[PDB]
């Protein structure tokens, strides 16, 4: 079957090459490439699903695609916008199918054939590698749910992917300042915890310690050194017509007020997200304490000490908390 594998790799390469540099009119190639994932043949699924990850990471737009249905539009006036809308709808559909397949493959009862176990591990790896950049997109909640269910398994030491998923969640919580993705993760985490009666590993519960939304730093903290040209030089400008210059002034005036409004909205939403996350985190901590799990006391107390002012044994644990070289444990000492 080796030559079949070579031909399969060649076909996957041809399809991905057809899709990559011009995605818009190669929609059918992407469709068949995604359809190849759900194939019962382990090689087809493995190779196609592992090859789609760079494709999606490269072609996923920077925004969330709204369900623009023609009912309210009734436009039918486009020759390039129409194909853009078609490509966006097809991308959303294909991503839906891909994420559903990843979620289905991640669920492995650890009793099937080792090929099934490897398929589940590879699907979890693909989902974890996908969410690093696709968190600001549709169907992020499904990836979050599958990753957390893999993490919140009673035994995760034998799983070779739990460490990496823990680091990914810690990074996601650490680099989020508004508190939207943090709240989305925390709601699913609490929902899963309520199902398992709050029984997880210390490393799993330690990711809440990295919530940036529950941190205030010095008001004028020094950031990384960024140097760029303050303005394009006057003698090196491009010619613009009077109509173009007036349009530029108008769009700059629009952009300034949009920036001000976005700043205000982010400021007023961070506080609400912080309140909701505080409620969820404190409920989790208190329910752990009432459950009285001997292996989670230190982390719960450290979290209470860290986030208490935001409100109104190292050998037994794995995957040391993020920035452990700088985060000296105040209460959860060795």
């Amino acid at each position: 079957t080796e030559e079949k594998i070579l031909q399969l790799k060649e076909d996957i390469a041809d399809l991905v090459t057809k899709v990559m540099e011009e995605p818009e009119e190669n929609t059918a190639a992407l469709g068949r490439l995604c359809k190849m994932v759900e194939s019962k043949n382990p090689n087809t699924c493995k190779f196609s699903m592992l090859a789609l990850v760079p494709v999606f990471k490269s072609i996923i737009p920077g925004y969330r695609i709204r369900p623009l249905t023609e009912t309210e539009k009734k436009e039918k006036v486009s020759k390039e916008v129409s194909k853009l809308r078609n490509f966006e709808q097809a991308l959303v559909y294909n991503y839906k199918n891909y994420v559903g397949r990843l979620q289905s493959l991640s669920k492995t009862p650890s009793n099937a054939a080792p090929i099934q176990v490897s398929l589940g591990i590879l699907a979890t790896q693909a989902a974890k590698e996908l969410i690093s950049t696709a968190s600001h997109f549709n169907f992020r909640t499904d990836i979050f749910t599958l990753l957390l269910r893999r993490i919140c398994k009673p035994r995760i030491s034998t799983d070779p992917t739990s460490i990496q998923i823990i680091q990914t969640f810690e990074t996601l919580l650490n680099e989020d300042e508004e508190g939207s993705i943090s709240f989305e993760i925390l709601r699913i985490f609490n929902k899963i915890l309520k199902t398992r009666n709050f029984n997880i590993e210390e490393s799993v519960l330690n990711m809440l310690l990295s919530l940036d939304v529950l941190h205030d730093y010095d008001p004028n903290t020094k950031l990384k050194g960024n140097v760029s040209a303050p303005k394009l030089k006057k003698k090196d400008r491009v010619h613009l017509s009077k109509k173009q210059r007036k349009a530029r002034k108008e769009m700059q005036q629009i952009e300034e007020e949009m920036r001000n409004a976005e700043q205000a909205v982010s400021a007023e939403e961070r506080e609400r997200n912080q309140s909701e996350i505080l409620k969820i985190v404190f409920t989790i901590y208190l329910n752990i304490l009432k459950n009285n799990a001997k292996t989670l006391i230190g982390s719960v107390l450290e979290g209470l000490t860290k986030f208490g002012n935001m409100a109104n044994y190292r050998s037994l644990r794995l995957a040391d908390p993020l920035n452990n070289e700088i985060i000296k444990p105040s209460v959860n000492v060795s």
């Binding site: 730093y217 010095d218 004028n220 903290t221 020094k222 990384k224 700088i326 985060i327 000296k328």
Partner: protein, 58 residues
């Protein structure tokens, strides 16, 4: 020979310009000996990065 713009400025704006310069000099001298007047860059250096603050906490 004095230029026309120089004559006009010296007749009109010289006195208040000199008075304002003296006022800035006096205020700078008064504030030099006081504590609590630091620039944005200096205060940013004093506070440090997030990693520096986490090290200071530890």
């Amino acid at each position: 020979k004095v230029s026309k713009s120089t004559k006009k400025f010296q007749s009109k704006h010289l006195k208040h310009t000199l008075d304002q310069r003296r006022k800035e000099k006096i205020q700078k001298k008064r504030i030099q000996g006081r504590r609590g007047n630091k620039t944005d860059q200096e205060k940013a250096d004093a506070a440090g990065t997030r990693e520096q603050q986490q090290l200071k906490k530890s």
